[model samples]
Target: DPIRLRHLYTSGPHGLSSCFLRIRADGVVDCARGQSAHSLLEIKAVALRTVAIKGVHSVRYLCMGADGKMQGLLQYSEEDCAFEEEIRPDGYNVYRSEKHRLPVSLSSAKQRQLYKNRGFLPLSHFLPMLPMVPEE
Candidate 1:
């Protein structure tokens, strides 16, 4: 799947939240949104990563999950969760990574919620990123 790094920043002492989006092959966005009634794969949250960014710092992770909606008490933990995938009778690769589309700038209300929910601690207010614009 296409792994995209998403950043959320807060002004408090404990600031900085990071998340990754794993898109389905069908071009569906999974911003860790709970799930769809027709999902066929599951996703899992693994661990966090501290990496060097052009002499700066950043955080990220590897996670797991399945697609297809299921009925259960969906909960979030620092570790992982087990949910069912709404699999189709035809076996298909349900997940794939795509070109990251969101901007380095933050605005979405959902992004704000993720910051509060994930409790991410930013390495710096100036979250750095690679040039999305192609260089000549």
Candidate 2:
């Protein structure tokens, strides 16, 4: 009843890794850079200053490890997964973990395997995308 869904599209370090953030089936948080399904997430407001994010495709909660690494959890962890949602003047939202006090972002180095800049970023910024409308 309190689901506010959106897509977190990473802006990268420069302009090189502009893509969507997603949690893979392996519980690794990375950018699939797609509208292909994995990027879709639900932003659930946990408090006035915080929100909980989860991957719609992978069915996992987005959590930041205490070591400042991003991981996908099968179950939600209030102390680990809750993030402070802040939008700056750049028109992008920064998802900072409440416990670890770190921002979530995708790796902006370059292409790896079949994905470009799909690694985890302990700190980065991302713009939210509107959900697509369905046609009758």
Candidate 3:
């Protein structure tokens, strides 16, 4: 089965620094700031403890290199791109890159608040929009 999910990719110890993992129409995957041009990702279960992710265009797959950096559509090898989804205590999902050994998480207070409220962030005085399909 395939699931459509969106999330803020946070780095640092506490996940204070964040970026939106966006999948571009051209099949590129990268992080973006406040206003995201493309942020939704498609996750598909490929095997036990492993999955494949791609953009809305379905032309590319998310892959991480040994350097712990992410890219899209270079290849479809499981050893390079499969991610093991770990459920975090904070109700957010952590995606550990199979090859890079890095866990991608949403580690910001605002992101946590959004997850808890089911996409509403009242504390920030702004209603965050749910990730949407990119315009064609």
Candidate 4:
């Protein structure tokens, strides 16, 4: 199959918190509320259910630390950057760090709920992608 590019759209009970997961050039893993273009990520599959998420705009790889804290890196870190793509029956996807085992999620609320793995399910359902500005 072809590599997939998508807008990692995460939403929940509040629904108001729905947005795209963005790994910005400055290394911040935050939520983009609107057409914050940086939210587009390219998903490369090295194996079944294992994915490497690269920022389409920032050109950085999404990696998680032992503490479940994530950062954007310029290099490919193999297992460090690989994430397990889990799908829910409702059609949402949960991206958990392959080694760390913590789901990829937003900030503030995510910070408070680290390891607790509760309060709300981290759901990042893939959405249709916007075409690249001019095909980079």
Candidate 5:
């Protein structure tokens, strides 16, 4: 499979980051500050506000191993279960409105490796209207 967890970058300050991931589905997952980057990012539990499955036609999840090998595959619907869609105030919609976290620890070696190789992934061209957080 060609799907790979490519890179990790600080989306900006305020603890936001983006993971650029490429997959065998002939698509890419741009895990922006709060959106699903792709199936791999979703399966790994990276809280995504938006998700764009591009490239080929199909997008699916896979169980990855320590050596960066695939262990299994998961349906998009199954991974979709991990996210919920909601309506926004601008007569538009927003993703990642609900709470979800990444499955792998940020300190994990594999995750670090992915970040190291992030430069090779394609850039995400889309941008969603991010909602403002309520003040405490």
Candidate 6:
């Protein structure tokens, strides 16, 4: 299956209104405070638990190193780049680094309510729309 652009939200420490993981044109991923969705904000699933976030006009995959921090880069191996997403009971997805054993989570929440108002549904609501892929 081809990758598709999707918006991802993380739970912030303060609540649901602080930070959002954004992909830049240079393939740099970071948490930023913004309400509007930019093309740099789009991410596409490349594997069962891996996603390549779009950068500028090229492809940059999301990866985590031994340092336990997330980064977007143009070159990376799947073994070191894949992320396992865990669905939380609160309706958010927690992305954990397959290699680093670190999680891509929000540091802070007020922004979360804004997303809710913008119609960003929880993972539970979004999962059903995805066609099931049989195990290999």
TM per prediction = 0.16, 0.79, 0.59, 0.80, 0.25, 0.58
Q: Model 1 over residues 1-136: C-alpha lDDT tens digits?
A: 3233322221324333342232333433333322222222223322232121110011112222232211122233222222121222433111211212111112243443443467422221322122243221
Worst 10 residues of 1 by lDDT: 50-59
- For model 2, residues 12-115, the per-residue Cα lDDT tens digits are 45767557788787898876656656778878888986889988888899987745567899999888889888897877788777577557756433322212
As a whole number from 0 to 100, the lDDT of residue 60 in candidate 2 is 92
lDDT of 5 by residue, 14-91 (tens): 434453333444332323333232322322333333332222223444323343232223344334333333344534
Candidate order, lDDT descending: 4, 2, 3, 6, 5, 1
Please, what are the lDDT tens digits per residue for candidate 3 over residues 1-136? 6454543444343556456666565655555665454555566788776777766444567776633445676458787678887665555566676555555432243454443467432111111234654433
- Residue ranges of candidate 6 with Cα displaced over 4 Å: 35-52, 56-58, 106-136
lDDT of 6 by residue, 1-136 (tens): 5545454544334555544465565655665554333223334576786654444333566666544445567786766666665666756666656665545533223433433476332211111112133211
Q: List the global CA lDDT of all models.
A: 0.25, 0.72, 0.54, 0.73, 0.30, 0.48
Off by over 4 Å in 3: 5-18, 24-28, 34-37, 105-136
Candidate 3 vs candidate 5, TM-score winner: 3
**Residue 94: error of model 5 in Å?**
1.7
Q: Model 3, 110: alpha-carbon shift in Å?
A: 24
User: By how many angstroms RMSD does model 6 differ from the true structure?
Assistant: 9.6
Report clashes for each candidate as comma-separated counts.
23, 0, 0, 0, 15, 11
Best by TM-score: 4
RMSD of every candidate to native, in Å, equals 17.6, 6.0, 9.2, 2.9, 13.2, 9.6
Cα lDDT of candidate 4 equals: 0.73
Q: Which has the better lDDT: candidate 5, or candidate 6?
A: 6
